[model samples]
Target chain A: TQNLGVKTATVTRGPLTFAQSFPANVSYNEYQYAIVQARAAGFIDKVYPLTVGDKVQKGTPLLDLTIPDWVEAQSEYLLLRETGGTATQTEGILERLRLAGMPEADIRRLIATQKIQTRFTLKAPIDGVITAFDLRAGMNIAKDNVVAKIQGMDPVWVTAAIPESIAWLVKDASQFTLTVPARPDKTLTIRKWTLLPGVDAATRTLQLRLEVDNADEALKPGMNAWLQLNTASEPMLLIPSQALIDTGSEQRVITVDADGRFVPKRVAVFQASQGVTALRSGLAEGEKVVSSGLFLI
Target chain B: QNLGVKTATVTRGPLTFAQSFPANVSYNEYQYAIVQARAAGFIDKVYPLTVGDKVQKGTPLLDLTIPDWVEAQSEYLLLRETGGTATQTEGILERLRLAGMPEADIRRLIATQKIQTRFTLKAPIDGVITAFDLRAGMNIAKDNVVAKIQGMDPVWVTAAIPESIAWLVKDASQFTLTVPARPDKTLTIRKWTLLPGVDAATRTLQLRLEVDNADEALKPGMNAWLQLNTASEPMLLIPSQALIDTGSEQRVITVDADGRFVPKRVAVFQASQGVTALRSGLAEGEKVVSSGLFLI
Candidate 1:
């Protein structure tokens, strides 16, 4: 009886239940996908140095073009004003320039300077990345040609395929950790979780989406990521894991009372993970479980 | 996002999340052994027996180049090749076989009619060298220690699993383990069995698994992080702080669309962490107060 090798743990009340991890696929979050199309037929004079993957701020220069229609209309309006022309002709010329897709700023500049401008600069409509672009220097552009495409990159989406068995438990939780395989050293925290409609039939998995802050532009779309979900966080009476003797039919733990005598007690446990066993019933807070020599007792 | 008195939108969907804990990687003690030399000879040459070298059964360890067994093998081969008396040849072959000349070696001698002077020491089991001692040209006595080899086909992944999810370990036969250093590679272990003992110090049930390590990627003393799926249930869940339990009745301050707080009695199913699942009295898509329930 000299070597019993006994150990014990305190029965504390806190949330210790850990949830299972699910594979989450990362993608770009839903943001404005602006398609920059030509509003007037023009000849592309100079294109910007930005490529398809470059980030651009709002009002950044995209390209320089010369619209013949806008130039002709502005020349007519300038001629009417300079020669004391009729108001009807000047108004008609102004209407034609507006219909030819001239911006309010361009019209204001023409009126302010009374100069018939031939070149117009198109700037980015939103702060985003260049998703698509094909324009170059000295190219004949049409009114319907798509000059650039920009997508916002402030928040990225992490879509995870959750199994149907636990779909009811995946609510909008503010606590979660996202880890991407590409950036193994860094961790991302999520506050808002969104659930997509419908379930996948062939895979029997539901889609859970979470938007994480990507202001640094370090994360990329189409990368594999894992979302560590915080499950149970309620105060529960905990016991040592080895205290309970699993008998296949029922679970029992040997408790030592104030008299230092071993007494077998049946306990109910729920939601176990890590090192602590959360007892549902049949145990008290101050009770001590036999940590060693379970078989001998 | 307003931070003052945050509210949770009651969402209706699956509540699936993964729990992770620090896991340890070690060799199965049952499948490891220190190999000892059975025959005495000068270690003519030793194969590269590094600390972590993976070797299969019959893989060369050391070549003795002993002349004693070579002469016996040559004598036995000559009797069989020269067509001596059938009884004498058969008797000599049996003696050589009884003297521990492997049948495969004897057959090789008969097929090639050459004396294999150099005896190459081969591994008896597929394992890794846990410890190495023998060197080239070193004289080894009978039963001398050569190299300690531990089987690598099946390795033990030890984790102190929490008691609440201990039953799930029995249901789950496969698990995914990722190393913290190399998160790009995730190892899925299929062959798993529950260990009989539990750790008293950590208050955790010992869930042991034996996984195949054919690629030598899983090594001893490597820190492994495992994500375990434990349990799931459907219930009306709300923030834990929102519930006001006064002796008998548990009530929550339910807010209406008209911006009014109303106390409603609700049945609680399970209370855990920051959220509590309800048995009844709450509907989906409803907003509940999470921060200011105690003040009200």
Candidate 2:
């Protein structure tokens, strides 16, 4: 009975990489920009029923304006188009309208219908959340004024501050796990992060930016998060994930005689990444653990 | 001739940054070896070797006469010389071995039936003798350090960088160093370290590099130049030679449009070797006396 066949493996010391937690905050990727500006001197006749934090898709109407000041330019273009105007004359007028920030679609409509576009509706240029929208139903806005700004949010950037002492360990790590206090039930794993260029003098902390996918709009900008950053590896015992017998509340493993008879021991394990678990305690290096064929019914 | 100090213009843009720092080398605190005798002895012979002489591991430095070892050896020899079995005298034999006597010396003494006292204190590491202050007729106690050996390997190369370019240095940065004595040779160090905060008076960030002392090229107290990439960080920098560390404060000689020179006190965050990082006092496009500030 003592010679029962049991597949066992050695608990050996190895390079076990683990993550250290640091304070992080979610932010919008600053590169993706969408600015909605007044193309001409306009009176905001109808403001879209949306708030600053409301989400908007491309082509969704942001505001309806009566840019009566653009009337003269459009009428001049029409007057040139009325007769068999020469290419040189019409081309010069079209260039002026284009130079005035008139949307190409509005200019094309005016050319097709031969009517002035005194009133036009401005729509969202990209799919994003409106960050700054402050227009009333009847406000006189100047030409080239920034009316609304939408920022991309599908993939938000998480900025984490690392202490200068541990900057060496956390610099080369690409993959990281992030936990937001707002959503404590879930953990987001992100691999795409870049070290920001500078360190502020007094803080003595290096900043890192992790790109996190927020396709479901679950994560929001300015959310406080705890980011787990991978650090340098140290010596620890590693064993196969299958060797640990998991109960409802705890985990354990059966050791098949390295120096003595077979025995069972309780263990606490760290979160596993590959097929092997590294940080399970109550075991030492070079101990034989039953990896398979634990005799039980 | 004092007005011969050169002049240079202040530049502004996407950073044309390069820095050369004058660094001093120092002995690694953890790597030097000490050659000490394990048994008490009197120096009977001294080698005619200077401090700078290169030595390999196990090279004889001096000879010692351990009169106590002679008594211990005779006791071990007489026990075996009498009608004592090999196992009966083995206890006395192992005792001599326990007292810092090598197995080869014990076996040789047994083969020759000679009582031994003289032992040679050899080098502990393949290094150069930095200190060996022993002569004939000097009493050397047990565990006394007889010699200090400085290895060919570890020396620190350190420099000061301003916070403006401090960000460019990271965990993955490689620092390249060169000594004036050996101009053709270069050292690329990867595992360097940066200490915390600005100095109390210098107002600069300091970093130390442990350069690989390959080919026995680097030595402590030697001056060297360290260079690193000034990547992507904007610095309102001026030539370090132009910025004078004054008797009371840090200042630079400023020149207007053919105007008189003014020594303006400025807060220096860091000086990037040949270049210095400015915080508040100096204007970006202002010109400075590039060199020879003492006459000013």
After superposing candidate 1, which stretches have Cα over 4 Å from the reference? A1-16, A50-59, A83-100, A137-143, A184-187, A233-237, A240-271, A284-297, B1-296
Q: lDDT of candidate 1?
A: 0.67
lDDT (Cα, tens digit) per residue for candidate 1, span A1-297: 234466665566676645556687768745567788889778887787878878886659998887775665677677778789899978876777677677878778877876667588989887878887866887777768788888887777888876544455445565466777787654375657665544675555667778887766677777888777655544677776766678585677777664556676877765455666666566788777776444463
Write model 1 residue lDDT over B1-296, tens digit each, in one string: 23367676665532434556678888878777766655566766676556667665647777775545767666777777687898886787777767656687777776787776566766767777777844769866667777777877677777786444554454453356767766665565756655434455654667776676666676778888766654465566677776668655777776678877777777754433346666677787678877653342
Q: Distance (Å) between predicted and true CA of A151, model 2? A: 3.4
What docking class should model 1 receive? incorrect
Among the numbered candidates, top DockQ falls to 1
Best by lDDT: 2
Model 1 chain A: ten consecutive residues of lowest lDDT: A163-172
By summed lDDT, the worst window of 10 consecutive residues in model 1 chain B runs over: B165-174
Summed over model 2, clashes come to 1
| DockQ of all predictions against the true structure, Cα-based | 0.04, 0.02
